[PDB]
Every structure is written in C-alpha cells, then in structure tokens.
From a paper:
The colE proteins are nonspecific DNases, which are produced by [name] to eliminate neighboring bacteria. To avoid autotoxicity, the producing cells co-express Im proteins, which tightly bind and inhibit colE’s activity. In the colE/Im system, comprising four homologous pairs (colEwt2/Imwt2, colEwt7/Imwt7, colEwt8/Imwt8, and colEwt9/Imwt9), each cognate pair forms an ultrahigh affinity complex (KD < 10−13 M), whereas the non-cognate pairs show non-protective affinities (KD > 10−10 M). Our results demonstrate that the design of substantially different backbone conformations, orientations, and sequences at the binding site generates dozens of new interaction pairs from a single starting one.
To verify the atomic accuracy of the design procedure, we determined the structures of two designed pairs by X-ray crystallography: [name]/[name] with >3 orders of magnitude pairwise specificity relative to the wild-type colEwt2/Imwt2 and colEdes7/Imdes7 with low Im specificity. In both structures, the conserved hotspot region formed as predicted. To test whether cognate affinity could be improved, we focused on [name]/[name], which exhibited KD = 73 nM and at least three orders of magnitude pairwise specificity relative to colEwt2/Imwt2. Furthermore, the high-specificity design, [name]/[name] showed high accuracy throughout loop I (0.5 Å Cα rmsd over all Im side chains). The designed rigid-body orientation and side-chain conformations at the interface were also atomically accurate, except two polar side chains (Asn31 and Gln34) that reoriented due to a water molecule that was not modeled by Rosetta. Apart from this difference, the polar interaction network in this complex formed with remarkably high accuracy compared to the designed one. Due to backbone preorganization, the designed polar interactions can only form accurately in the cognate pairs as seen in the crystallographic analysis of the high-specificity pair [name]/[name].
Author numbering:
A (entry chain C): 2 to 88
B (entry chain B): 4 to 129
The structure:
Amino acid sequence: ELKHSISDYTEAEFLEFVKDIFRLSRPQDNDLQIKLVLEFKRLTEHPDGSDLIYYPRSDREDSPEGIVKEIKEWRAANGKSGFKQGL
Amino acid sequence: KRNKPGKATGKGKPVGDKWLDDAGKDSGAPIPDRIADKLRDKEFKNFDDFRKKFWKEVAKDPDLAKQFSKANQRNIKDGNAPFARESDQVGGRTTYELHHDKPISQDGGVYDMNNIRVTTPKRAID
C-alpha cells in the first residue's frame, strides 16, 4: 500500500526513515544511502535538501529527531501538507 | 594505478579547526600530518583501501571528527567518505574525495600523502 508523499508517513515513520539514513554509513551501502537521501529530498521538498541531514543549522538538535522537528515546523509555516496525524 | 597494492609515504601538513572548510576551497586540503603519522609505513591493498582507512583515522582524531555533523561522523567511523554540502556537490558526486596533486611518476606514488588532497566534488576539477 505504498507511500509516495510525505503525508503518507506518520511522524514516527518518517523519523525512522531518517534514522535509517544515519545508519547507512557503511561503504557497502552507498547506493541505498544516496537513494534514500534523494527520496528524502523529494518528500520534504525542503530547500536545504541533504544539508538538513549532513550540515544542520546549529541551534537545533543534530539528530534525526531535530531533523523531523525542523521539517514539521517548516512545512507548517509554508502552508504545505504535514505528516499523517497520530497514526 | 589505484588498483595495485603498496605502502603509504610522506608527512602531510599541520591542520586546525578549519581543515574541512579548506577542502571546499582551491586545491582542497592536505592530509593532516597526525593522520599521515598513523598511515605512513602501512601496506594498502589498493587506493580504495587507503581511503577507507584514511576516513577511519579522521574519525579517531577528535579535532577532525568534531568538524563533521553526527551523520557524517558515522560515515567516517565506517570508512565511508562524508557527504558534501549541496552547494559543493556536482550532480552525481556527493562526497568528499581524495585526489593527487602531481602526476604519479614512481612506484607507490599513488600513496604519497604529500601529494593527496581532500576536496569537495566541486574542487576536484581543480
């Protein structure tokens, strides 16, 4: 029942997705890593793209949790569709 | 070539808190001298093997590892080259790269750490 936009993810689901990115740090996983980073850029549509992960702003937490919060707050304030609510 | 085993040589350069920053500027950044000290007379299977062990040594050196975000620290702890900033990326090339400064003249020149620079993809071109 496949997910195509960020509205198809609950917050915890998208959080886990971002954690997966952090964990795919082995050279043997490069292909999956780049593909999940692309998908992340497509789903978020955030203008910093991969920098949210790898070059975060300094005044929020450098963690997948801090990334999701910045994405939620950003999508909210530009009137864009959010995460699937609750579950 | 990159694919032939050999032994690393040379000293590198002293480096500070802005090392990684310099990698994104003209000619990139040197191999840090304290990393060269760790790699200097070791035998490598190929350049790929060198790169992997380079990044792993960068991870173990707190004053270099602190220059990267947490996701990139995970990359380098595993010997995987770290993701560059979007502005430093060139299409398909997303990671910091290692490149040679001078034409390779002699045997084992692939592993001369006097002549290797760490660069963003954007600065690899030269």
